[PDB]
Design an enzyme around this catalytic site. Structure first.
Site, PDB file in Angstrom:
ATOM      1  N   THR E   1     -56.949  14.830 -45.777  1.00  0.00           N
ATOM      2  CA  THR E   1     -56.458  16.170 -46.228  1.00  0.00           C
ATOM      3  C   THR E   1     -56.244  16.516 -47.703  1.00  0.00           C
ATOM      4  OG1 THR E   1     -55.436  16.228 -44.087  1.00  0.00           O
ATOM      5  CG2 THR E   1     -54.655  17.858 -45.609  1.00  0.00           C
ATOM      6  N   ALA E  49     -52.428  13.286 -37.728  1.00  0.00           N
ATOM      7  CA  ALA E  49     -52.832  14.547 -37.099  1.00  0.00           C
ATOM      8  C   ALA E  49     -51.920  14.950 -35.944  1.00  0.00           C
ATOM      9  CB  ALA E  49     -54.272  14.459 -36.625  1.00  0.00           C
TER      10      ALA E  49
HETATM   11  C1  LIG Z   1     -56.802  14.180 -44.430  1.00  0.00           C
HETATM   12  C2  LIG Z   1     -58.161  14.316 -43.655  1.00  0.00           C
HETATM   13  C3  LIG Z   1     -56.467  12.689 -44.620  1.00  0.00           C
HETATM   14  O1  LIG Z   1     -57.106  11.970 -43.559  1.00  0.00           O
HETATM   15  C4  LIG Z   1     -55.582  14.877 -43.627  1.00  0.00           C
HETATM   16  O2  LIG Z   1     -54.349  14.218 -43.930  1.00  0.00           O
HETATM   17  C5  LIG Z   1     -55.705  14.986 -42.095  1.00  0.00           C
HETATM   18  C6  LIG Z   1     -54.696  16.048 -41.651  1.00  0.00           C
HETATM   19  C7  LIG Z   1     -54.879  16.553 -40.336  1.00  0.00           C
HETATM   20  C8  LIG Z   1     -53.903  17.445 -39.873  1.00  0.00           C
HETATM   21  C9  LIG Z   1     -53.962  18.014 -38.604  1.00  0.00           C
HETATM   22  C10 LIG Z   1     -55.022  17.695 -37.764  1.00  0.00           C
HETATM   23  C11 LIG Z   1     -56.006  16.814 -38.206  1.00  0.00           C
HETATM   24  C12 LIG Z   1     -55.940  16.247 -39.479  1.00  0.00           C
HETATM   25  N1  LIG Z   1     -55.330  13.705 -41.485  1.00  0.00           N
HETATM   26  C13 LIG Z   1     -56.110  13.044 -40.617  1.00  0.00           C
HETATM   27  O3  LIG Z   1     -57.229  13.404 -40.254  1.00  0.00           O
HETATM   28  C14 LIG Z   1     -55.505  11.752 -40.082  1.00  0.00           C
HETATM   29  C15 LIG Z   1     -55.509  10.723 -41.184  1.00  0.00           C
HETATM   30  C16 LIG Z   1     -54.575   9.744 -40.819  1.00  0.00           C
HETATM   31  C17 LIG Z   1     -54.895   8.797 -39.846  1.00  0.00           C
HETATM   32  C18 LIG Z   1     -53.973   7.821 -39.484  1.00  0.00           C
HETATM   33  C19 LIG Z   1     -52.720   7.776 -40.088  1.00  0.00           C
HETATM   34  O4  LIG Z   1     -51.838   6.794 -39.717  1.00  0.00           O
HETATM   35  C20 LIG Z   1     -50.483   7.207 -39.455  1.00  0.00           C
HETATM   36  C21 LIG Z   1     -52.401   8.717 -41.069  1.00  0.00           C
HETATM   37  C22 LIG Z   1     -53.322   9.695 -41.428  1.00  0.00           C
HETATM   38  N2  LIG Z   1     -56.338  11.284 -38.966  1.00  0.00           N
HETATM   39  C23 LIG Z   1     -55.848  11.093 -37.732  1.00  0.00           C
HETATM   40  O5  LIG Z   1     -54.677  11.289 -37.399  1.00  0.00           O
HETATM   41  C24 LIG Z   1     -56.875  10.590 -36.721  1.00  0.00           C
HETATM   42  C25 LIG Z   1     -57.654  11.775 -36.152  1.00  0.00           C
HETATM   43  N3  LIG Z   1     -56.182   9.895 -35.633  1.00  0.00           N
HETATM   44  C26 LIG Z   1     -56.014   8.562 -35.632  1.00  0.00           C
HETATM   45  O6  LIG Z   1     -56.425   7.807 -36.513  1.00  0.00           O
HETATM   46  C27 LIG Z   1     -55.270   8.010 -34.404  1.00  0.00           C
HETATM   47  N4  LIG Z   1     -54.269   7.045 -34.856  1.00  0.00           N
HETATM   48  C28 LIG Z   1     -53.211   7.742 -35.632  1.00  0.00           C
HETATM   49  C29 LIG Z   1     -52.034   6.872 -35.947  1.00  0.00           C
HETATM   50  O7  LIG Z   1     -51.572   6.345 -34.680  1.00  0.00           O
HETATM   51  C30 LIG Z   1     -52.562   5.546 -34.006  1.00  0.00           C
HETATM   52  C31 LIG Z   1     -53.731   6.385 -33.638  1.00  0.00           C
END
Ligand SMILES: *[C@@](C)(CO)[C@](*)(O)[C@H](Cc1ccccc1)NC(=O)[C@H](Cc1ccc(OC)cc1)NC(=O)[C@H](C)NC(=O)CN1CCOCC1
Ligand SMILES: [Mg+2]
Ligand SMILES: [Mg+2]
Lengths: 222, 231, 244, 195, 212, 240, 235, 233
Positions: E1, E49
């Site tokens: 993000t 997310a």
């Molecule tokens: C940018 C792309 C940084 O990656 C943004 O912060 C974005 C924000 C966002 C907001 C709403 C909906 C979608 C995206 N964040 C992500 O895409 C996020 C990055 C991230 C992953 C893991 C984290 O660990 C806590 C922190 C940030 N991506 C996700 O959440 C992905 C889609 N999901 C996973 O990796 C599932 N994981 C999350 C943590 O728990 C275990 C499973």
């Protein structure tokens, strides 16, 4: 030390049309380098024209589907047999998944069906409840192989109109159920070739206003 | 008299008056009829209204795809008990991948109602239930009373003036038991049975309530224009 | 069940009174009279022991007057056993306040908390109230010398001079007559004893039937001293005022 | 959170507190006030773990304000500091302790004396003529050892404080975006707007 | 993000990217990172997310219950503090949330509140949050003035996300613009970086590092 | 825990324990609330059977809940402390989470909610207390005056009285208070409040307490001499 | 004494039956359901003229599509409304949709019998829950402390209930407009009310699909009162 | 969090035209020590189900007791306990599968791999697997441990898919199982020669065979093998 998670492999795929939606998934189940079953279905009819699949760790996957199926049942009891809309189901699933935020279901979940306007709908989830409606989603082990192919063929990404100097994009249009099933079958045969955890059989669940139909196809068994 | 203050007290003749007063709430309730053949089981319930402007109190509740009941007495107590049955039917499915037997369903209700009649503070349930279902041993009909006493029957009826319908069924026993592979004729026998309990009023379109379960028929309730066929 | 035997201690009468609080006050009205008198330069606590026997050990005894901390003391009227429960609670509350703020507890704060405990027994729990009335005599650097009283209702009020227990009606009239604002401790000592001497149900007031205490700034420079009078010291002060 | 200073002079207590709020490689804010008014004549500055700092400061503030309403009376700086210390002393043996260090500058109206207390997250209280938390102390203490006098005026105290901030701006690795200065005296608490 | 929102003469601009990542895997290009809490409140989200999605939707429920109970729309301060107090309860558990509660009320005026998962809550005029916040800051700070027009402010917010979408590998997809006024928030469309980049490059004459 | 349902319905549809709690309020010393154009005044009776009192330390009848809201009451004194304490805590809790002091309506609503909870909780009796809650909302100059009672109902009043002989003083206020034109100044409002208490009290010496609340946390309690001047002025005008 | 959850010889719960007597003492509340909307109206009944009648809140919003009017011991309704509001918002959070009016009513009625020796006594208040959903359309429910709820085309509760209910019986038909229903509530309220009906001692509200639940202003209700008087004098 | 102590090795099974076959050796290993030689790891439930269990034996004995207790509980207030309302393989499996997953979810697993073989009331063959993780799957051939690596390949040459089941007789199916047990004895270092075999047929019912032995073993070729490369003597 005891490890509560495992990888049962396989891969799933959801595509949405104008008045229909498909949710496909290979029937192979594995652990490490062994095949457990050549036919173990993981795409389920959950009632109210909602199909669901939770690919990844099968124990958590089956547990989730089981709970959602039960969630649909109690939705009928508590709200006068009202039909659970696909958008409502999706939100309900988010709460199921996030409920175990700190000990997650190791599954990439996909549901498919029709929205309240009768149009095709595919929702997709991460392991902890994050969700988003899309026209297109591949999930599981071979998701990285299939997904870009779908971007190209379903959403017409990187495709421009010939002779327009890369200025006019190829126009978006819905696909026919015949064209979608072609893409599904080619996606899975391609994924079978290059991914060891994918193969044996392909089972597609098609969802129209008339109901839920099934189709099965053989895949390479190596 | 002096022995009806609570459910924990026996009378000198060995009676539980609070349980008997709970039984009295059923007699005040609207009539409902239950009957079965070998293929199907049918619930027929006369719904009651507060006045012409009000709706008609829903008497029949679904417990599972293969089981459900009709109520007579306190409706909230029926909701509590039906909800308990829904969970027990559901527990049997999730854990054992097994549809709950209608006999066990009755045993579970009996044991739940009993605990309320032996403990201080609580009260007996103020409702009678007629449970129908189709399981691995065919069609069934149960009669639940809040004393705890559950009884399996071919046919029965509970509520106000239920003796009229119960006598009719006792005469018609040999006829309706052999209505196999015919839903509409079994319902007709039930609608004719409940008619024996009517006084002044007759069966109208938004008054009558019918439910059915059977061999190739899930538990489904019929109300409104769907029951106009049987009037 | 048990409902049959419940007295229902925490309910209202049709008139809007708390039965048990009223009956607890009726109990206290038979207890030995206790008087508190607040002067400009100190406080006096005087109390009459309940019909003393000649074989009662008088010097190593404590019935009426108790010490809560170095700056605060109480006179009791009612059930002694009940009072001691409340006193130990009050003693602990004072030490908690000192532990928390590194400052001796203000008199009113201690009084309020103890009164709040009594209030609780009249509103919830289904238990009988404490059959006790206190006279709090204390000092702090905010309000200086202070007299309070609390009763089983949990209601407390501040006083210049006050009596609790038996014959409070007669005692309060006599105090209201002879009390004045520019009074000294030695004068208040005399008033306290004279009042008891006239309101007593006994034939004559003697040293063995009294507990007495003062809270003066009579120590050396800007500090408070608590004096729980000894038997001989009461005997001397009784002769000095000309009662015996 | 990083730099919080305190200087008790003749008739007042002066608290300086850095304005920078940094997270990662970004200064998110350069105008942050790292203090709360506990009572009209008592001010507490704070520094430490993110989130904990404000959560703790406001929790203390609420309790002191509750006391003030209940008794219709202001608690002494000594009493407030003892209350704060006990809260931190409980905290340190909790499941998740508050990681917050504080300075409590107050004017005692009964004694007519300014008072400065330094309390760390363990619950270690000390009354000082001048105090500091974090790396600031390693420069300011020796500087104040030299230049501080007990009979200084508030104006002299501010110049002494300027001398600290200049030394920190010269030798500290991190940019703390200057300080917000506040004075606590007989007339209450006021902020120096131009520093 | 990459998410930003800044205060200016004509209210508040709010701009976000639309990329979701699972490591170096691009999970999505079409994700919504602005939650519309009510006609006067917006919430940007960066970080985990599900954490973001779940708790911001939850925040909207708490804001609805406030106006039902109090017969009055919740303040931006109170709304942000509900969320900051919530994440503070989960401090240490591993929640990942970088949010910005943007909105207008009568008593406050236009207000922005930065709230993150380790309990930090800050009022301010300019904030950038996310993996590409530094890239957005670079463009935003160097062009920001209070006296910007609604037209220029909208573009600067759009251009700042574009800048980050370009350089930051974990930002991109498309730009979602919003404008918050005294009358409430106004949506200013979705802008795909696929077209927007070349449109901006040509018209602005910038991005000379790229092969044109 | 003690569970007994003390507050229960009777055949005629009454909860006697709540009604008997009202009798305790009727026994309590009179309290009056009158709100003017830019102020609210809380008057309170203090029974004169108690001499040799220490008025410095004796709990005052009017209590500050926050710097901008006050609470007077009639009924059981011990009970009132519990409500006041809860209200004071909730006032600080509201500032902590909402970053804004309570409105007078909200504070009233909370206090009334507590009172109500004790009318259908097991093992407890209702509060033998009615309250008059008065003040000014944050950044607002409109005067607020509310009343609560044991049952848990609450409502706003232009002027109101509670306690013993309250029906007499309510009769006075009903004809003397004009809705179209409330007391324009502080003096007019205080005078009307004192006048209303003088119908009931006995003597205007150390029997009447007056507390004036004005906008932006401006609360002050009047002394004996200040109140006595109103008493002297009213009696001279009366002889006519 | 005797148990709280005790049955009478006739087969009724004493405490539930006594709570119904309390509701009869309460102020009148009327609800009328039409195809154009549901109308809710109440008698405020100020105990004294000094009481500011606009602070009397006997009509209440649960959600944007569900309203509520009360009668009896109105202090008891606070926790019922709180629960209803939470239930409505919670369901929206779990299912991303508006909650059915019946499901909301059922949720409220589940509290009703959660009393005994849970709370110490039944509620002393009856509720008229009016709302709209996509499935069953405009609905009016009467929720009692017995745990029972009936759907109504029109319903009156409170002190003038039996007199008003007989009047609603004759007047109601399935083709009533919203404007007609508004006047009908005002007409029937004025008949059963002790004091003379005006904009200050009576309040109107309605719920429509388009605009949701709205409590009417005193200016708007005053015009409907004036429109009502003219129409009755006109024949 | 456990570690298995006394352990049981491969459980192998397959479907045939009228029912199912299941087999498991009678060894209770204690690491490399072949400690206990009289251990029965096939446990019949009623006359229509057999549960084969590998892994920790203490946990196996716990599961035995649960099944034993399940039969008792089913008989309570059940006139049709030996008829229509008898315990089905699918009921027995789902119960265990529920337990296994609940235990792994509490981070305290029953350290086992289980195969529930049986015949349903309507004549359908039931064969399904479940393990310590709560992972479940069904196939014409199922095997645990080394069986999965060595038995399944051999058993799948007989029944490679669903359509091969009607074509497979009990004689052919049993021969394949007994062969697989021999191959496992050659190659599994924690296996024994002695084993038990069970056949659940829809016609002939439950046939439980005890004290079987691996026989017709090829060892004669060993005498020719000299050294490890360049040795002649
Ligand atoms: C940018 C792309 C940084 O990656 C943004 O912060 C974005 C924000 C966002 C907001 C709403 C909906 C979608 C995206 N964040 C992500 O895409 C996020 C990055 C991230 C992953 C893991 C984290 O660990 C806590 C922190 C940030 N991506 C996700 O959440 C992905 C889609 N999901 C996973 O990796 C599932 N994981 C999350 C943590 O728990 C275990 C499973
Ligand atoms: Mg292979
Ligand atoms: Mg990028």
């Amino acid at each position: 030390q005891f490890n509560p998670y495992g990888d049962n492999g396989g891969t799933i795929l959801g595509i949405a049309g104008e008045d229909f939606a498909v949710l496909a998934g290979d029937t192979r189940n594995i652990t490490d380098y062994s095949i457990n079953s050549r036919y173990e279905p993981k795409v389920f009819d959950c009632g109210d024209n909602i199909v669901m699949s939770a690919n990844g760790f099968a124990a958590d996957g089956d547990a989730l589907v089981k709970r959602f199926k039960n969630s649909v049942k109690w939705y009928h009891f508590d709200h006068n047999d009202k039909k659970l809309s696909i958008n409502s189901a999706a939100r309900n699933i988010q709460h199921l998944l996030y409920g175990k935020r700190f000990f997650p279901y190791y599954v990439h979940t996909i549901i498919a069906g029709l929205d309240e306007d009768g149009k095709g709908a595919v929702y997709s989830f991460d392991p902890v409840g994050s969700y988003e409606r899309e026209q297109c989603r591949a999930g599981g082990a071979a998701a990285s192989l299939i997904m870009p192919f779908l971007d190209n063929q379903v959403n017409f990404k990187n495709q421009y109109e010939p002779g327009t100097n890369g200025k006019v994009k190829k126009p978006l249009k819905y696909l026919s159920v015949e064209e979608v099933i072609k893409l599904v079958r080619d996606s899975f045969t391609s994924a079978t070739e290059r991914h060891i955890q994918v193969g044996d059989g392909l089972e597609i669940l098609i969802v129209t206003k008339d109901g839920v139909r099934k189709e099965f196809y053989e895949l390479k068994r190596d | 008299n002096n022995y009806d203050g609570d459910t924990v007290t026996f009378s000198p003749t060995g009676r539980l008056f609070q349980v008997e007063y709970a039984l009295e709430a059923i007699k005040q309730g609207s009539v409902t009829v239950g009957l079965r053949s070998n293929t199907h089981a049918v619930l027929v319930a006369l719904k009651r209204n507060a006045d012409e402007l009000s709706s008609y109190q829903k008497k029949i509740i679904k417990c599972d795809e293969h089981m459900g009941l009709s109520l007579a007495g306190l409706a909230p107590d029926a909701r509590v008990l039906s909800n308990y049955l829904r969970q027990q039917c559901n527990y049997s499915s999730l854990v054992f991948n097994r549809k709950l037997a209608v006999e066990r369903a009755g045993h579970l209700l009996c044991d739940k109602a009993q605990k309320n009649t032996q403990s201080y503070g609580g009260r007996p349930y103020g409702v009678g239930l007629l449970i129908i279902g189709y399981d691995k041993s065919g069609a069934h009909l149960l009669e639940f009373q809040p004393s705890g006493n559950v009884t399996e029957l071919y046919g029965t009826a509970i509520g106000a003036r239920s003796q009229g319908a119960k006598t009719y069924l006792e005469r018609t026993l040999d006829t309706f038991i052999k209505i196999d592979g015919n839903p509409d004729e079994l319902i007709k026998a039930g609608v004719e049975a409940i008619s024996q309990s009517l006084r002044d009023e007759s069966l109208t379109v938004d008054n009558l309530s019918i439910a059915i379960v059977g061999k190739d028929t899930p538990f489904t309730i019929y109300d409104g224009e769907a029951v106009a066929k049987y009037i | 069940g048990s409902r049959r035997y419940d007295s229902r201690t925490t309910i209202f009468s049709p008139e809007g009174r708390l039965y048990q609080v009223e009956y607890a006050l009726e109990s206290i009205s038979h207890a030995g009279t206790a008087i508190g008198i607040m002067a400009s330069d100190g406080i006096v606590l005087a109390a009459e022991r309940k019909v003393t026997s000649t074989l009662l050990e008088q010097d190593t005894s404590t019935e009426k007057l108790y010490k809560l901390n170095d700056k605060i003391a109480v006179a009791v009227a009612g059930l002694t056993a009940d009072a001691e429960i409340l006193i130990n609670t009050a003693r602990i509350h004072a030490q908690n306040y000192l532990k928390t703020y590194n400052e001796d507890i203000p008199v009113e704060i201690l009084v309020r908390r103890l009164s709040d405990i009594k209030q609780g027994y009249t509103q919830h729990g289904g238990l009988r109230p404490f059959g006790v009335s206190f006279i709090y005599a204390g000092y702090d650097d905010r309000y200086g010398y202070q007299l309070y009283t609390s009763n089983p209702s949990g209601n407390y009020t501040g006083w210049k001079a006050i009596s609790v227990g038996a014959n409070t009606s007669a005692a309060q009239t006599l105090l209201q007559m002879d009390y004045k604002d520019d009074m000294k401790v030695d004068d208040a000592i005399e008033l306290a004893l004279k009042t008891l001497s006239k309101t007593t149900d006994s034939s004559a007031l003697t040293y063995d039937r009294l507990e007495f205490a003062t809270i003066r700034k009579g120590a050396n420079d800007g500090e408070v001293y608590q004096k729980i009078f000894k038997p001989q010291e009461i005997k001397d002060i009784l002769v000095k005022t000309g009662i015996t | 959170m990083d730099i919080i200073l305190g200087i008790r002079v003749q008739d007042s207590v002066i608290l300086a507190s850095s304005k920078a709020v940094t997270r990662g490689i970004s200064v998110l804010k350069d105008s942050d006030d790292k203090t709360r008014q506990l009572s009209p004549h008592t001010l507490m500055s704070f520094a430490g773990e993110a989130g904990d700092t404000v959560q703790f400061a406001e929790y203390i503030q609420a309790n002191i304000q509750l006391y003030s309403i209940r008794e219709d009376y202001e608690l002494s700086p000594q009493a407030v500091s003892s209350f704060v210390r006990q809260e931190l002393a409980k905290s340190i043996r909790s499941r998740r302790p508050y990681q917050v260090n504080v300075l409590i500058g107050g004017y005692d109206k009964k004694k007519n004396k300014p008072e400065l207390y330094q309390i760390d997250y363990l619950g270690t209280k000390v009354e000082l003529p001048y105090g500091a938390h974090g790396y600031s102390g390693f420069y300011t203490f020796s500087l104040l050892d030299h230049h501080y006098r007990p009979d200084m005026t508030t104006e002299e105290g501010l110049d002494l404080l300027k001398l600290c901030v200049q030394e920190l701006e010269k030798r500290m690795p991190m940019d703390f975006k200057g300080v917000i200065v506040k004075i606590v005296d007989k007339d209450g608490i006021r902020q120096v707007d131009d520093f | 993000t990459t998410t930003l929102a800044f205060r200016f003469q004509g209210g508040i601009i709010v701009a976000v990217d639309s990329r979701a990542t699972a490591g170096n895997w691009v999970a999505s290009q079409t994700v919504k990172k602005v939650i519309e809490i009510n006609p006067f409140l917006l919430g940007t989200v960066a970080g985990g997310a599900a954490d973001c999605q779940f708790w911001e939707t939850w925040l909207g429920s708490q804001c609805r219950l406030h106006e039902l109970r109090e017969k009055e729309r919740i303040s931006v301060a109170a709304a942000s503090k509900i969320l900051s107090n919530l994440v503070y309860q989960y401090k240490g558990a591993g929640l990942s949330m970088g949010t910005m509660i943007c909105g207008y009320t009568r008593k406050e005026g236009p207000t922005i509140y930065y709230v993150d998962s380790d309990g930090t809550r800050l009022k301010g005029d300019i904030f950038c949050v996310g993996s590409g916040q530094t890239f957005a800051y670079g463009v935003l700070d160097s062009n920001y003035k209070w006296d910007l027009s609604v037209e220029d402010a909208l573009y600067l917010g759009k251009r700042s996300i574009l800048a980050a979408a370009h350089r930051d590998a974990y930002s991109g997809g498309s730009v979602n613009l919003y404008h918050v006024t005294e009358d409430g928030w106004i949506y200013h469309g979705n802008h795909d970086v696929g077209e927007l980049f070349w449109k901006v490059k040509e018209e602005e004459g910038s991005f000379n590092n790229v092969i044109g | 825990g003690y569970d007994r349902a003390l507050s229960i319905f009777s055949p005629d549809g009454h909860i006697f324990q709540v009604e008997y709690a009202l009798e305790a309020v009727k026994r309590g010393t009179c309290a009056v609330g009158v709100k003017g154009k830019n102020c609210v005044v809380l008057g309170c009776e203090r029974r004169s059977t108690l001499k040799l009192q220490d008025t410095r330390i004796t709990p005052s009848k009017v209590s500050k809940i926050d710097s901008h809201v006050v609470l007077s009451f009639s009924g059981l004194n011990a009970d009132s402390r519990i409500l006041i304490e809860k209200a004071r805590v909730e006032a600080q809790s509201h500032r902590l989470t909402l970053e804004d002091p309570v409105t007078v309506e909200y504070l009233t609503r909370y206090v009334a909610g507590v009172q109500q909870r004790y009318t259908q909780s097991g093992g407890v009796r209702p509060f033998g207390v009615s309250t008059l809650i008065a003040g000014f909302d944050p950044r607002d100059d409109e005067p607020k005056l509310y009343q609560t009672e044991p049952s848990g109902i609450y409502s706003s009043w232009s002027a109101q009285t509670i306690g013993r002989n309250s029906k007499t003083v309510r009769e006075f206020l009903e004809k003397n208070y004009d809705r179209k034109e409330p007391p324009a100044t502080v003096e007019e409002c205080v005078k009307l409040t004192v006048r209303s208490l003088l119908e009931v009290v006995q003597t205007g010496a150390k029997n009447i307490e007056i507390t004036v609340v004005k906008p932006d946390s401006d609360i002050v309690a009047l002394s004996s001499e200040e109140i006595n001047q109103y008493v002297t002025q009213i009696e001279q005008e009366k002889q006519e | 004494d005797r148990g709280v959850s005790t049955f009478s010889p006739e087969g009724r719960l004493f405490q539930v039956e006594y709570s119904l007597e309390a509701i009869k003492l309460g102020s009148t509340a009327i609800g009328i359901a039409t195809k154009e909307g549901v109308v809710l109206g109440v008698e405020k009944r100020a105990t004294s003229p000094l009481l500011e009648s606009d602070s009397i809140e006997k009509i209440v919003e649960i959600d944007r599509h569900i309203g509520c009017a009360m009668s009896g011991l109105t202090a008891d309704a606070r926790s019922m409304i709180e629960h209803a509001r939470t239930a409505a918002v919670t369901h929206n959070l779990y299912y991303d949709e508006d909650i059915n009016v019946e499901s909301l009513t059922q949720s409220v009625c589940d509290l009703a019998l959660r009393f005994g020796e849970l709370m110490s006594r039944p509620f002393g208040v009856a509720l008229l829950i009016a709302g709209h959903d996509a499935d069953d359309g405009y609905q009016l429910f009467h929720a009692e402390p017995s745990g029972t709820f009936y759907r109504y085309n029109a319903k009156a509760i409170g002190s003038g209930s039996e007199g008003a209910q007989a009047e609603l019986l004759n007047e109601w038909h399935s083709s009533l407009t919203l404007k007609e229903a508004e006047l009908l509530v005002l007409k029937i309220l004025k008949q059963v009310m002790e004091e003379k009906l005006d904009e200050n001692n009576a309040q109107l509200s309605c719920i429509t699909k388009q605009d949701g639940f709205k409590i009417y202003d005193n200016e708007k209700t005053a015009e409907l009162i004036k429109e009502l008087k003219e129409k009755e004098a006109a024949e | 969090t456990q570690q298995p102590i006394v352990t049981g090795t491969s459980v192998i099974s397959m479907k045939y035209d009228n029912g199912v076959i299941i087999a498991a050796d009678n060894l209770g290993s204690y690491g490399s020590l072949l400690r206990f030689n009289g251990v029965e790891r096939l446990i019949p439930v009623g006359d229509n189900t057999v549960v084969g269990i590998s892994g920790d034996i203490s946990d196996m004995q716990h599961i035995e007791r649960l099944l034993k207790d399940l039969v008792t509980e089913n008989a309570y207030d059940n006139p049709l306990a030996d008829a229509e309302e008898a315990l089905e393989p699918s009921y027995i499996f789902e119960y265990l599968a529920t337990v296994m997953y609940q235990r792994r979810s509490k981070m305290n697993p029953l350290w086992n791999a289980i195969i529930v073989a049986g015949v349903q009331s309507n004549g359908d063959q039931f064969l399904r697997y479940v393990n310590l993780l709560g992972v479940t799957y069904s196939s014409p051939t199922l095997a645990t441990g080394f069986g999965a690596h060595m038995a399944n390949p051999l058993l799948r040459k007989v029944v490679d898919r669903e359509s091969d089941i009607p074509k497979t007789t009990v004689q052919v199916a049993e021969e394949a199982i007994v062969n697989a047990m021999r191959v496992l004895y050659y190659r599994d270092a924690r296996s024994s020669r002695n084993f038990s075999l069970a056949i659940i047929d829809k016609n002939t019912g439950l046939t439980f065979k005890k004290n079987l032995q691996v026989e017709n073993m090829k060892w004669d070729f060993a005498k020719d093998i000299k050294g490890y490369g360049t040795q002649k003597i």
